[PDB]
Structures are given as C-alpha cells and as structure tokens.
Amino acid sequence: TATTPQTTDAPAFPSNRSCPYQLPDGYAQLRDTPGPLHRVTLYDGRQAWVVTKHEAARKLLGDPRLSSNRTDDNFPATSPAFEAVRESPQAFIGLDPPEHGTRRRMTISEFTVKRIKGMRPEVEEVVHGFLDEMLAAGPTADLVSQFALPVPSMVICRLLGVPYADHEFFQDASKRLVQSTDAQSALTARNDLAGYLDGLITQFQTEPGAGLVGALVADQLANGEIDREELISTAMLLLIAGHETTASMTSLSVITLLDHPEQYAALRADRSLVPGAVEELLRYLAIADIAGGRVATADIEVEGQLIRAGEGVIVVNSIANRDGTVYEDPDALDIHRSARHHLAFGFGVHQCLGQNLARLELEVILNALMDRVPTLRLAVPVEQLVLRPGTTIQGVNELPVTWH
Ligand code: HEM
Ligand SMILES: C=C1/C(=C\C=C2/CCC[C@]3(C)[C@@H]([C@H](C)/C=C/[C@H](C)C(C)(C)O)CC[C@@H]23)C[C@@H](O)C[C@@H]1O
C-alpha cells in the first residue's frame, strides 16, 4: 500500500472553509507560496492551475486566451455536478467575445446605476417587509429562510418578471442546482427550472408582460436574435445568481460582524461607513471564490511559468483578495480600509452584472438590521454552524438568531 510521505505539489482543490470568514488552511498555504500560479488536483485526478495573486488574477481574467467556455473538454470541472453544465446550453457567463457581448447587452438595461437607484424604495420595502414579519413573530428564527433568501428572491423575481407566487418551487430548484454534488441531481434541478421558465415564455408570447423575461420575449426572441433555449439559460442564470449570492453575503456578513463587535459598533454609530463596510465584507467573504474557471485556447506565459493551450485555470478570488501586497494585513477585517480593486465580483468582460444591485441590497439590509434589530445575535455558537463545501457558493444553509 501507500507507505511513503504523502506530500504533494498539486494539492486537492477546492478545500472547505472551517471558519466562515477565513481562508481554508490549504488556501492560506497557496496564498503564501510565491508566484502567480499553482498546480492543483481536481476531484477526478486531472491537474489544473489556480491563480493565487491579485495582479496576476486581473491580468488572466482580462486575457482573451483564457476562454469561459464550460462546454470545452478541458474546462476545469470542480465536482461531478459540473457535468450538467458541460452538457446543457450556455448563458453568457459561458460565452467569449463577440457572442458574450451580444447576449450580455440584452440584459444590461435592468442593472444600470439609474435603474438601481430607482429600485431603492422597492428594496427597502421588501427588506422591512420581511423584518416586520420575522420580528412580529418573535425569536428564535432561522435568518436564512426567514430573511436572507426571500429578500433577494423577491427583488430578482420582480426584475425578471417571474411570479413570486412560485417561490417555493424555484428557490428549492435553485438550491438543488447550485448545491448539487452529482450530475443527475444537477440535471434534474436544471430541467425543473427550464420547464418552468419555458412555460413562462409562451405565456408572455400570448400576453406581453413586465420584467426582463417579458422584454426579451417581446423583442429579441420575436426578432430571432436569441434562441428560446438561450433565453431560458439566461433567465436561469439571473434567477439563480440573484437568489443565492446576496443571500449568502447576508448570512455570512451577520456572522462575521457579530464576531467583530468593535467594528459592528462603529458601523452602527456612523452609517456613512456602510458602503465601505460592504466592500470590505465582499473582499473578505469572497463567496463566489471558484467562479473563475477558464480554459486556455493558446499558450500563455505568466511571469516565467507556462499555461499551455488546453489546460484548466481557476482564478480563485478569495485567495487573490488576501494578497498582502494590495491589502495591508489582508486577513484582518477592517471596515475602514480601502477595499478598492477587490476581485469578489471578478474583473474584465465577465465582471458581475449584478454587482451594483448586490451593493444596494447589502447596504439596505445592514442598515435595516442595525435600525430594527440592534440586539440581534446568534442563537447558537459559531462552531456549531454547518458551512457549505468549497465546491459551491460559500455560506450556511441555516442561521439561528435571537434578539429583544
Ligand atoms: C452578492 C454577491 C455577488 C457576488 C460575490 C458575485 C460574484 C460574481 C463573480 C465572481 C462573477 C464572475 C464570473 C466569471 O468571471 O466567470 C459574477 C458574474 C455574474 N454575476 Fe454576480 N455576484 C454577486 C451578485 C450577483 C447578483 C445579485 C446578480 C443578479 C443577477 C448577479 C449576476 C451575475 C451575472 C449575470 C454574471 C455573469 C456576467 C458575465 O458573464 O458577463 N451577481 N458574479
Ligand atoms: C445556473 C446555470 C446552470 C447551472 C449552474 C450550476 C450547476 C453546477 C455548479 C455551478 C456551476 C456552481 C459552482 C459554484 C460553480 C463552479 C465553477 C463553474 C467552477 C469554475 C467549475 O468552479 C454555481 C452554479 C452551478 C445551468 C445553465 O444552463 C445556466 C446557468 O449557467
């Protein structure tokens, strides 16, 4: 059997967090090793590169030789579940220029600074809505199911024109898809959403409707500028991204802030600090840290290392956000620091489309919690919480809380 030292120069990747707001030990090890790249071993034994420094992450995310095509044979699959995406049609997150741009520009109008400003009343109403329900009822509560998830779900459903009456079905399907550990579970959840979305489209062709899905049906689809299957994939991307990301940030931010009480107190005492604290929480929690998979379509030299055509690269933004050449004392939460230039939303042509909606939601959420529930606290110890694995969007599925 295996009788000799087990040390490797290609550690298994991804790794799981042990603390909700710290790098897994393996990732801290990658962060420490000099050089922009490091070999890793994926779940199926294939080797890939991870990018572990901040400037090299921007350079590689900006390089069009690193393709986002998830259907490529050599795309770095991080779990068996990925096989679902490899064989399903692709929203623009998986396209490269010029096709990427033609699809992304069909959606941008809903996410402009002006549209996001105009959404503030609505976001505050939904947030205070779910709080007055949770507070009317009294502690204890699961903050995830009573607040963290339904808030961004309601907001994104409205933007998309997806009926909130249907929330139990699609929230369930979103979770199963994103947290799937096998191909078959992922495929089923994807087929569930696809069928639901496909029915919604035919409805709008009969009776034009509000929201982005309504607009896409009435314009681009009727002009044959998007295929019906691409519309489904696009809507599914926005639906899932709109649900799962903000919800994960909300629960992890509560946990993290309650663990740094001096900074949470500073935050409450000066609300002009909230936008900066949001950026710092984004930098520090990096909830989509493996949403940086790429395949090289040509050889790329990186500071004397060679990524060859055909090789998988993952730009790991959690690690990149802990680069001490950019953020002094990178592992310290500091809501006053400049968290400018962080990579929690990526960089370049695929930088998060929803990033300013997420910023608005989190600002409104933190202000509301501080205003309405200043006594909020965890109902259980941090160590008792169950953290999702490193193969999915970071966070917790349950968060017990109590208050006055
Ligand atoms: C709240 C925290 C969020 C985080 C940390 C986050 C993170 C990211 C990252 C790292 C990427 C880049 C993926 C890549 O380069 O392959 C991305 C892309 C994307 N995000 Fe977000 N995101 C968040 C919120 C949202 C929200 C609320 C939406 C609403 C729909 C959204 C929609 C998208 C879309 C459509 C893309 C693909 C953009 C493109 O391919 O051009 N995101 N996000
Ligand atoms: C939500 C979509 C779909 C699937 C999404 C999935 C299934 C597998 C695992 C996914 C890709 C999650 C994980 C976190 C992403 C991993 C990335 C990639 C890599 C680079 C492999 O680590 C997020 C969303 C999940 C179906 C597709 O047709 C449309 C849309 O992209």
272 annotated ligand binder: no
Ligand nearest to the CA of 72: 2
CA dist 78 and 188 (Å) reads 19
Domain, as residue range, for 218: 1-404
- Name the domain count of the chain: 1
Q: Is the CB of 186 under 6 A from ligand 2?
A: yes
Method used experimentally: X-ray
Entry resolution (Å):
1.9
Give the HSE-up count for residue 180: Cα atoms under 13 Å, Cβ half-sphere.
Answer: 21
Ligand nearest to the CA of 107: 1
185 annotated ligand binder: no
Query: φ, ψ for residue 128 (rounded to 5)?
Result: -70, -35
Q: Is the CB of 245 under 6 A from ligand 1?
A: yes
Picking from 71, 117, 194, 2, the residue whose alpha carbon sits closest to that of residue 357 is 117
CATH code of the domain in which 33 resides: 1.10.630.10
